[PDB]
Design an enzyme around this catalytic site. Structure first.
Site, mmCIF file in Angstrom:
data_model
loop_
_atom_site.group_PDB
_atom_site.id
_atom_site.type_symbol
_atom_site.label_atom_id
_atom_site.label_comp_id
_atom_site.label_asym_id
_atom_site.label_seq_id
_atom_site.Cartn_x
_atom_site.Cartn_y
_atom_site.Cartn_z
ATOM 1 N N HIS A 1 71.855 -71.050 8.296
ATOM 2 C CA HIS A 1 72.552 -70.180 9.236
ATOM 3 C C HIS A 1 71.763 -69.974 10.515
ATOM 4 O O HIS A 1 72.103 -69.084 11.306
ATOM 5 C CB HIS A 1 72.876 -68.856 8.538
ATOM 6 C CG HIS A 1 73.383 -69.053 7.146
ATOM 7 N ND1 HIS A 1 74.564 -69.713 6.879
ATOM 8 C CD2 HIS A 1 72.835 -68.756 5.941
ATOM 9 C CE1 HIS A 1 74.740 -69.783 5.572
ATOM 10 N NE2 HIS A 1 73.705 -69.213 4.979
ATOM 11 N N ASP B 1 77.272 -65.649 14.442
ATOM 12 C CA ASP B 1 77.479 -65.863 13.015
ATOM 13 C C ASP B 1 78.602 -64.957 12.525
ATOM 14 O O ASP B 1 78.869 -63.897 13.100
ATOM 15 C CB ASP B 1 76.185 -65.597 12.238
ATOM 16 C CG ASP B 1 76.265 -66.068 10.775
ATOM 17 O OD1 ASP B 1 76.003 -67.270 10.524
ATOM 18 O OD2 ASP B 1 76.585 -65.243 9.880
#
Ligand SMILES: O=c1ccn([C@@H]2O[C@H](COP(=O)(O)OP(=O)(O)O[C@H]3O[C@H](CO)[C@@H](O)[C@H](O)[C@H]3O)[C@@H](O)[C@H]2O)c(=O)[nH]1
Length: 436
Positions: free
Chosen positions: A15, A112
């Protein structure tokens, strides 16, 4: 003049790296944005810390914004990364005061999905591009999680059904920690300016077509492929490159399951036994509690001396690599992978055939996408016969002519997509163009 954009990264290598890649691309020609890269601190792993430090030292024009979020206390039977992800989601609403101080005034944020609720509620007038880090295929399932009721195949209308064995069981429990922040953030996807995906049109055309055409998933904003993301240059050159330079073309198997895989010592032993019996050479990233990358004492104990010697004569047992530098080397002929999506897309970029041993989460669906695209083959029951699975399938990936050609064709289209004029570069240029 040039737009100022914020890139909001999450936590964990999977991520982190696509956000670093995006920040790097947007700060350079032809995008020429001013980029502020937001980092959540503290970081959990040393791999993260070194990757981030190395990044900012090699991208001096990219501004760093540290966003401090207290580490949550550990809890029995709760995964520490999930706890961290939850703390980020819970803190995202605090971003206004931090982003308001930035100059010149920001034109957009690329974030994100953990930030979705916070950004789309407290900064509703700032265009937010939610950048998912998984496949378009698995993203559709995640966006559907708020509508789940089951042990039946999940059929999102307009898409091929998701079999039960491919869905993480926690998704059917709204109170599970991961499901909870998946639901809370997915409920605000409709307020995002778009969903960005690290994929390309010819890699997932059936999924992308459904999402876009309207409908499936009416209330999503446009879902925009922007991958593969052009790779970073790394500060330190990869230590295995001179050895790789000495190997014949496409003769080396790269083996990596990433930092988040829980293979037991017994599984690692069987994998080693299988590799020793194969004909190709290899590079195998093996997790070891010793901190010095050169200390192999744990491997010697695990394999025993005879096996270890044979393994070390035939391949490289290492603690870490610059993965894109490995997959980009002409000597690497195949990739045994857990199919974390960044790894899939790095292999796609280079046309490297994949032997898929998915472990958890999105990885089974990712493996299916890989197999459907002709990039690799998915061994559905690898865990039930590791040594045999290795002996039979490594020979096949390394030499099968049909898979080699179909994987090469994926690599040609992936390269085309991120090159100047490519479908993904064109999509990203149009986003940036809409900010000017
Ligand atoms: O030795 C290594 C290992 C990894 N990497 C890099 O780290 C990233 C790893 O990505 P990936 O394999 O996707 O990340 P994981 O953390 O392993 O995967 C998590 O994140 C992915 C993206 O959301 C998911 O698809 C997975 O299921 C999830 O567990 C890539 O850019 C790799 O190049 C290295 O450079 N060297």
């Amino acid at each position: 003049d040039q737009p100022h954009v914020v890139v909001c990264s999450g936590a964990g290598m999977g991520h982190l790296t696509p956000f670093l890649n995006l920040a790097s691309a947007l700060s350079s020609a032809p995008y020429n944005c001013k980029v502020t890269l937001l980092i959540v601190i503290p970081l959990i792993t040393d791999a993260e810390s070194h990757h981030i430090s190395s990044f900012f030292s090699s991208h001096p024009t990219i501004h760093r914004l540290d966003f401090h979020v207290n580490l949550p206390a550990p809890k029995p039977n709760v995964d520490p990364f999930f706890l961290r992800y939850k703390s980020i989601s819970d803190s995202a609403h605090r971003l206004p005061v931090h982003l308001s101080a930035l100059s010149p005034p920001i034109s957009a944020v690329f974030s994100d999905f953990l930030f979705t609720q916070g950004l789309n509620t407290t900064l509703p007038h700032l265009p937010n591009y939610t950048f998912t880090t998984t496949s378009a295929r698995f993203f559709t399932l995640m966006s559907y999680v708020p509508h789940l009721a089951s042990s039946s195949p999940v059929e999102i209308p307009g898409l091929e059904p998701f079999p039960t064995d491919n869905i993480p069981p926690p998704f059917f429990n709204p109170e599970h920690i991961f499901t909870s922040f998946t639901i809370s953030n997915a409920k605000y996807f409709s307020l995002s300016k778009g969903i960005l995906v690290n994929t390309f049109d010819s890699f997932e055309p059936e999924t992308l077509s459904a999402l876009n055409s309207g409908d499936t998933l009416s209330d999503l904003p446009p879902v925009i492929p922007i991958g593969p993301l052009n790779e970073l240059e790394h500060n330190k050159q990869e230590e295995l490159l001179p050895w790789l330079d000495q190997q014949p073309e496409k003769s080396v198997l790269y083996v990596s399951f990433g930092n988040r895989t829980a293979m037991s010592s017994d599984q690692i032993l069987e994998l080693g036994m299988g590799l020793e019996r194969s004909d190709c050479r290899f590079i195998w990233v093996v997790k070891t509690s010793k901190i010095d990358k050169d200390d192999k004492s744990e491997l010697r104990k695990l394999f025993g001396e005879e096996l270890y010697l044979k393994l070390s004569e035939k391949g490289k047992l290492v603690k870490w690599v610059n993965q894109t530098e490995i997959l980009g080397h002409t000597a690497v002929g195949g990739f045994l992978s857990h199919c974390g999506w960044n790894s899939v897309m790095e292999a796609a970029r280079r046309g490297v055939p994949i032997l898929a041993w998915p472990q958890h989460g999105d990885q089974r669906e990712n493996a299916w996408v890989v197999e459907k695209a002709g990039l690799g083959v998915w061994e559905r029951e690898w865990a039930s016969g590791i040594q045999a699975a290795i002996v039979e399938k490594v020979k096949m990936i390394m030499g099968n002519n049909d898979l080699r050609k179909s994987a090469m064709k994926v690599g040609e289209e992936a390269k085309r997509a991120c090159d100047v004029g490519g479908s993904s570069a064109t999509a990203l240029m149009n986003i940036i163009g809409s900010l000017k």
